[PDB]
Design an enzyme around this catalytic site. Structure first.
Site, PDB file in Angstrom:
ATOM      1  N   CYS A 294       0.791  -1.224   0.000  1.00 32.65           N
ATOM      2  CA  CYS A 294       0.000   0.000   0.000  1.00 32.65           C
ATOM      3  C   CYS A 294       0.815   1.260   0.000  1.00 32.65           C
ATOM      4  CB  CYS A 294      -0.888   0.057   1.224  1.00 32.65           C
ATOM      5  SG  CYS A 294       0.107   0.414   2.698  1.00 32.65           S
TER       6      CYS A 294
ATOM      7  N   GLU B  29      -7.120  -6.637   0.811  1.00 33.03           N
ATOM      8  CA  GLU B  29      -7.026  -5.664   1.905  1.00 33.03           C
ATOM      9  C   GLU B  29      -6.142  -4.501   1.515  1.00 33.03           C
ATOM     10  OE1 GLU B  29      -3.872  -5.111   4.044  1.00 33.03           O
ATOM     11  OE2 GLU B  29      -5.027  -3.489   4.997  1.00 33.03           O
TER      12      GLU B  29
ATOM     13  N   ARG C  96      -7.136   1.449  13.377  1.00 36.12           N
ATOM     14  CA  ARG C  96      -6.626   1.103  12.073  1.00 36.12           C
ATOM     15  C   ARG C  96      -7.768   0.980  11.046  1.00 36.12           C
ATOM     16  NH1 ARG C  96      -2.337  -3.067   9.670  1.00 36.12           N
ATOM     17  NH2 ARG C  96      -0.878  -1.487  10.468  1.00 36.12           N
TER      18      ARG C  96
ATOM     19  N   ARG D  20      -9.229   0.349   7.539  1.00 38.24           N
ATOM     20  CA  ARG D  20      -8.837  -0.359   6.332  1.00 38.24           C
ATOM     21  C   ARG D  20      -9.986  -0.656   5.360  1.00 38.24           C
ATOM     22  NH1 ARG D  20      -5.088   1.525   7.641  1.00 38.24           N
ATOM     23  NH2 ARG D  20      -2.932   0.839   7.930  1.00 38.24           N
TER      24      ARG D  20
END
Ligand SMILES: Nc1ncnc2c1ncn2[C@@H]1O[C@H](CSCC[C@H](N)C(=O)O)[C@@H](O)[C@H]1O
Length: 327
Positions: A81, A119, A163, A165
């Site tokens: 990412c 993800e 977090r 995502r």
DNA sequence: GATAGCGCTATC
DNA sequence: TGATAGCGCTATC
């Protein structure tokens, strides 16, 4: 991680691309499925995977003839990412590390897995005005899959970490999966202070710095949010201290700052970074997991891993939806 | 391969 | 806005 008894995925096989720590494996494995192939190039990542699964993943995915990949049912991938995170120079696909999706795509086109489970970071959602997402949405549809995506924020699923995502579940258009859904959120009742290690074990991480300023006073009551207490130096990344009474900021892989990668915490009157194991726990890893001997690498690793507990839910639902085959 | 000090962007 | 956050970037030893 969390315990599951309705092992919905028993008898299904899955591929662990960009294995990293194996978070995707642990998650799917806790549901009864089985990992038939794994891929991760980083030498150190390979070391821990082996240390914890007995296998050593194949190398550079870009140079792996797709045909070589075994038959499989679920494809798991948390592709790189760096090229889409809010934290970097957003070069996207122009970036050398932004085209691995297309490697996923050429894998899917040959093996046609029943499910694709990807993800990535939240900014991916909106990157390049959402073109990226759109490009992916479409690419998937053309290979004949339904695209389902949402941005879940770990702190809504039992883990004391903010977090955020994006998760992308794709189903082959055959199996008319029309009931899939993302785990409903729930009350956070576990915080950072509840995961910390005994002071004896942590001591060496403590940092005394005179340029330490205090912007806020410690909070008395628990809160499901990142309450920042202090700043060190110029308060940049890794230079901010948070309260062990709220939730842990996103752990990162390449982060800098005196409290690089974990951020700082005001633990019992002291200011320190988190210990690798604490990172693990905060990512929802069982204490049974073996962290890499090189701390720097352990940080990096967990840094771009994934919060297990969450995938646990999603997988269960991926399962639920696949087993509903009435007459 | 380790360590740190940065400098930017999204979000509202 | 004005203040916070970020599976980061990159010079140095
Ligand atoms: N071309 C490539 N081939 C193999 N591994 C690669 C790669 N490009 C990146 N990687 C690995 O991709 C991973 C992305 S982060 C995913 C981590 C994994 N879900 C875990 O639970 O921690 C990194 O470990 C990176 O080293």
């Amino acid at each position: 991680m969390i315990e599951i008894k309705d092992k919905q995925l028993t008898g299904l096989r899955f591929i662990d691309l960009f294995a990293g720590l194996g978070g995707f494996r642990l998650a799917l494995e806790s549901c009864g499925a089985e990992c038939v192939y794994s891929n991760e190039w980083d030498k150190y990542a390979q070391e821990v995977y082996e240390m914890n699964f007995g296998e050593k993943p194949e190398g550079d995915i870009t140079q792996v003839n797709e045909k070589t990949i075994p038959d499989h049912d679920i494809l798991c991938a948390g592709f790189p990412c760096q090229a889409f995170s809010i934290s970097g120079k957003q070069k996207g696909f122009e970036d050398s590390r932004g085209t691995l999706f297309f490697d996923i795509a050429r894998i899917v086109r040959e093996k046609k897995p029943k499910v694709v489970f990807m993800e990535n970071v939240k900014n991916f959602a909106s990157h390049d005005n959402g073109n990226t997402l759109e490009v992916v949405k479409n690419t998937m549809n053309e290979l004949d899959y339904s695209f389902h995506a949402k941005v879940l924020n770990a702190l809504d699923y039992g883990i004391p970490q903010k977090r955020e995502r994006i998760y992308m579940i794709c189903f082959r258009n055959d199996l008319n999966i029309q009931n899939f859904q993302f785990p409903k959120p729930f009350e956070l009742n576990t915080f950072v202070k509840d995961l910390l290690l005994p002071d004896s074990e942590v001591e060496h991480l403590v940092i005394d710095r005179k340029d330490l300023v205090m912007t806020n006073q410690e909070i008395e009551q628990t809160t499901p949010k990142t309450v920042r207490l202090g700043i060190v130096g110029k308060g940049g990344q890794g230079e901010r201290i948070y309260s062990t009474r709220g939730i842990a900021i996103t752990l990162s892989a390449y982060g800098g700052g005196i409290f690089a990668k974990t951020g700082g915490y005001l633990v019992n009157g002291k200011t320190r970074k988190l210990h690798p194991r604490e990172c693990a726990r905060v990512m929802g890893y069982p204490d049974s997991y073996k962290v890499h001997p090189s701390t720097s690498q352990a940080y990096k690793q967990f840094g771009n891993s994934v919060v297990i507990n969450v995938l646990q839910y999603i997988a269960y639902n991926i399962g639920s939806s696949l087993n509903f085959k009435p007459y």
